[PDB]
Amino acid sequence: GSAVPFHGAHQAGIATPVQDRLHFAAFDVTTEDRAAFVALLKEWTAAARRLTAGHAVGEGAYGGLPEAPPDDTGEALGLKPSRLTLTIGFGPSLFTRFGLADLRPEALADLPKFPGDNLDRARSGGDLCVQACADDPQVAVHAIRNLARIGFGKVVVRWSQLGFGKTSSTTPDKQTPRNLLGFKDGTRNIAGTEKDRLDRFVWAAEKDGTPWMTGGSYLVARRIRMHIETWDRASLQEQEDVFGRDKGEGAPVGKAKERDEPFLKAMKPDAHVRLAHPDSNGGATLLRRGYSFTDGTDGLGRLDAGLFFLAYQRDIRTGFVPVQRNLATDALNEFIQHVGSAVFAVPPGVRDADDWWGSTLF
Amino acid sequence: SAVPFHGAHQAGIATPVQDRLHFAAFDVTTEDRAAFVALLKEWTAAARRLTAGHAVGEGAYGGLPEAPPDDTGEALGLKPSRLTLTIGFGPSLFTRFGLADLRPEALADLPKFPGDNLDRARSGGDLCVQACADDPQVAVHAIRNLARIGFGKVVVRWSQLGFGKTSSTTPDKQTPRNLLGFKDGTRNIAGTEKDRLDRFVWAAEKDGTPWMTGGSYLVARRIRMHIETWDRASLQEQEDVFGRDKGEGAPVGKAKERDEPFLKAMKPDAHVRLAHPDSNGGATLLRRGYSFTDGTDGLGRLDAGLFFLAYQRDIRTGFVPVQRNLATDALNEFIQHVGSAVFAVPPGVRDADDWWGSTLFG
Ligand code: HEM
Numbered sequence: 001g002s003a004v005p006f007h008g009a010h011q012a013g014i015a016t017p018v019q020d021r022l023h024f025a026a027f028d029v030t031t032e033d034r035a036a037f038v039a040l041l042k043e044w045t046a047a048a049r050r051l052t053a054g055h056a057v058g059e060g061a062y063g064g065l066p067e068a069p070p071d072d073t074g075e076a077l078g079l080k081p082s083r084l085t086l087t088i089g090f091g092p093s094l095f096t097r098f099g100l101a102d103l104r105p106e107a108l109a110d111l112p113k114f115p116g117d118n119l120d121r122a123r124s125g126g127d128l129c130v131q132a133c134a135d136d137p138q139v140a141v142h143a144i145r146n147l148a149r150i151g152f153g154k155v156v157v158r159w160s161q162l163g164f165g166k167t168s169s170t171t172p173d174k175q176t177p178r179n180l181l182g183f184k185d186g187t188r189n190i191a192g193t194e195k196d197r198l199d200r201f202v203w204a205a206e207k208d209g210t211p212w213m214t215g216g217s218y219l220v221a222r223r224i225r226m227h228i229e230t231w232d233r234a235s236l237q238e239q240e241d242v243f244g245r246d247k248g249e250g251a252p253v254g255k256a257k258e259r260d261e262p263f264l265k266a267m268k269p270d271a272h273v274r275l276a277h278p279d280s281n282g283g284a285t286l287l288r289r290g291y292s293f294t295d296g297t298d299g300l301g302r303l304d305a306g307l308f309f310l311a312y313q314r315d316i317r318t319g320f321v322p323v324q325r326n327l328a329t330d331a332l333n334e335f336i337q338h339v340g341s342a343v344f345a346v347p348p349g350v351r352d353a354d355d356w357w358g359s360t361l362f
Numbered sequence: 363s364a365v366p367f368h369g370a371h372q373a374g375i376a377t378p379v380q381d382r383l384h385f386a387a388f389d390v391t392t393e394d395r396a397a398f399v400a401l402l403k404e405w406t407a408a409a410r411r412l413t414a415g416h417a418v419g420e421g422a423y424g425g426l427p428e429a430p431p432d433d434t435g436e437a438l439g440l441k442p443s444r445l446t447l448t449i450g451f452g453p454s455l456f457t458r459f460g461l462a463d464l465r466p467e468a469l470a471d472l473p474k475f476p477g478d479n480l481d482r483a484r485s486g487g488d489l490c491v492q493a494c495a496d497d498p499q500v501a502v503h504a505i506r507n508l509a510r511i512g513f514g515k516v517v518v519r520w521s522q523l524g525f526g527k528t529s530s531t532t533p534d535k536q537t538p539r540n541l542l543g544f545k546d547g548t549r550n551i552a553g554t555e556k557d558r559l560d561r562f563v564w565a566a567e568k569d570g571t572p573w574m575t576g577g578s579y580l581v582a583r584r585i586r587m588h589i590e591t592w593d594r595a596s597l598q599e600q601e602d603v604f605g606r607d608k609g610e611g612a613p614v615g616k617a618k619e620r621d622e623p624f625l626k627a628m629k630p631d632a633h634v635r636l637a638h639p640d641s642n643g644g645a646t647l648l649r650r651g652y653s654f655t656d657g658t659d660g661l662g663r664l665d666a667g668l669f670f671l672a673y674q675r676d677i678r679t680g681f682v683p684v685q686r687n688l689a690t691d692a693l694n695e696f697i698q699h700v701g702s703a704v705f706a707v708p709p710g711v712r713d714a715d716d717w718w719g720s721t722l723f724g
Pocket residue numbers: 179181183184185186187188189222224226243245262272273276277278286307309320323324327336
């Protein structure tokens with residue numbers, strides 16, 4: 001129920017322990033007024049400071065003038081902060097506005113088309129994103145709802161995705177969660193304590209070429225549908241062969257324990273772990289931070305199920321792209337389809353109470 | 363930790379309200395009564411394992427490598443999480459298996475209500491399973507595995523995820539708020555009120571349908587809220603719609619949440635005044651609904667609301683009179699009923715040899 005500090009050299013919500021729930025929103029910008037957008041970023045930052053401390057936005061949820069709408073919509077009253085983090089990112093399309101063309105980071109690369117992609121353009125892209133993570137879904141929805149309200153007339157929600165449970169880990173001391181295929185997902189990630197690895201693989205540095213992004217990161221989001229009918233009729237051995245880890249313990253094939261190091265040559269050549277491992281990708285390493293989803297039925301008698309894959313990295317071109325390119329032959333591809341995609345530049349942290357989201361850019 | 367599965371009544375009605383819901387409606391594809399009975403027995407056996415935190419069948423791993431696992435594995439390592447699984451039978455089931463003369467009279471078709479905009483695809487269903495647990499992955503796992511066991515005999519027609527409070531951070535005695543920011547559940551039937559349950563919730567043998575003794579009747583309504591319209595209303599308008607204040611949730615003119623309402627102080631079309639038993643000839647409901655937030659629609663609006671669940675001894679004397687009385691509810695401006703279903707929820711599974719539906723099928 002505790003608060004996660006909002007201020008820092010980096011935004012929270014990346015290296016932070018992974019919270020139970022996600023509400024991710026992508027927004028498009030509808031104002032051409034730079035000043036008006038800056039004013040919004042400042043108002044959003046002020047709101048975020050309140051929300052992440054478990055306080056209502058503005059002048060509160062009640063006790064104001066009866067004839068005015070409340071400043072806060074009120075559905076989080078009486079709730080703890082619930083480890084809420086709010087992480088903002090800027091999409092490539094933002095940089096066509098407000099005289100920002102020359103400030104688009106090279107590391108903010110458009111993704112190439114990957115074999116098997118079936119991207120819904122309506123649930124892809126976005127000028128900006130807010131990732132709300134919390135242990136309480138109500139706290140996360142409240143945050144997104146109030147941000148959108150504050151932004152009325154300046155931004156619209158383009159698409160959103162709720163995640164009912166995590167399928168990632170930045171805390172190797174704690175139990176690794178399972179995805180909806182039944183496997184542990186997050187064993188070999190980057191932990192929030194691994195400062196050297198975060199600097200090497202996750203945080204943008206000044207020397208990378210875009211000074212305003214120093215201390216930020218780059219985010220890839222992929223909405224991935226899972227073919228659970230197809231998966232659920234596969235044998236145990238087929239499932240384990242797909243990954244290169246056993247299902248029960250999640251140990252690498254041949255070994256006894258989850259956290260024993262993979263011996264890649266014992267895996268099938270098309271095993272997911274083998275193809276995704278840094279050693280198979282010239283050292284490319286990602287911070288994975290995704291969540292599971294189910295959005296009803298598919299209209300053909302089955303549950304809908306998928307994984308909202310999020311990865312943070314220092315450079316999209318040296319993180320997600322190489323690794324996804326190497327998954328072209330993945331055995332897992334029989335059972336998944338990417339159906340939504342977005343990339344974002346996640347700026348540096350809000351340093352103190354006078355700072356604001358995007359201040360280094362604007 | 364866990365809730366007993368066996369009882370005179372099914373669990374999940376009068377037992378403590380858990381933090382999360384996965385509700386699924388199923389349609390039956392087989393015409394063979396014997397095949398359906400066999401399915402009910404297999405599902406009962408699965409439910410016994412699931413509610414005790416155990417995998418279905420021979421487990422999620424460690425069986426024959428060349429066989430699909432009996433349990434899909436995504437709840438391994440999780441706790442029982444107070445899982446309850448409650449089954450119900452829709453009116454349409456009774457057109458199968460020679461059952462037409464065993465449809466309870468209390469399982470009434472709902473009339474059309476003013477302002478209904480029901481999606482046929484998220485309405486009805488031959489049967490339902492209500493899965494409630496504190497961990498949504500435990501609930502989803504239960505539905506996913508029941509659906510799998512049933513493949514070839516049943517299909518999933520529609521599915522809804524929902525959330526109430528998060529118990530780890532929110533005291534049990536605090537009333538949850540709905541997404542309109544009002545406390546929701548103050549004046550309800552509590553599972554401690556054994557006589558009120560007998561009067562208003564459980565079917566009695568003398569009511570007309572012996573197989574349903576100890577069962578109940580369920581109305582499910584998917585109710586969208588027009589969030590962005592509501593959030594533009596003044597605080598006064600919002601309070602006037604309900605007849606309670608927003609901060610404390612006290613009836614107008616009173617000081618505390620649990621102060622008994624004075625109906626005449628409320629506006630004539632206030633929700634509480636219209637829905638109160640005194641306004642409806644004494645009609646009283648067990649509400650056990652959950653909030654939902656599914657995402658955003660094509661206009662960028664929040665697809666959110668209340669998945670309303672009411673249990674009652676007879677649909678004709680519970681939901682129908684109360685909902686009829688809400689014809690002029692001030693709340694109607696901000697809500698729309700977009701899905702509907704009714705179910706007969708049979709008596710409890712008495713012991714280890716009993717099975718869901720045994721009083722009906724014989
Ligand atoms: C639905 C899609 C996916 C599923 C079900 C899935 C599942 C898994 C599982 C079970 C593991 C092993 C445990 C672990 O170390 O985390 C794993 C590892 C990994 N996955 Fe995936 N994954 C998916 C998509 C992706 C994608 C899209 C990428 C990157 C483009 C990726 C990158 C990785 C990486 C880097 C590892 C760790 C490999 C290592 O260093 O040992 N995964 N995944």
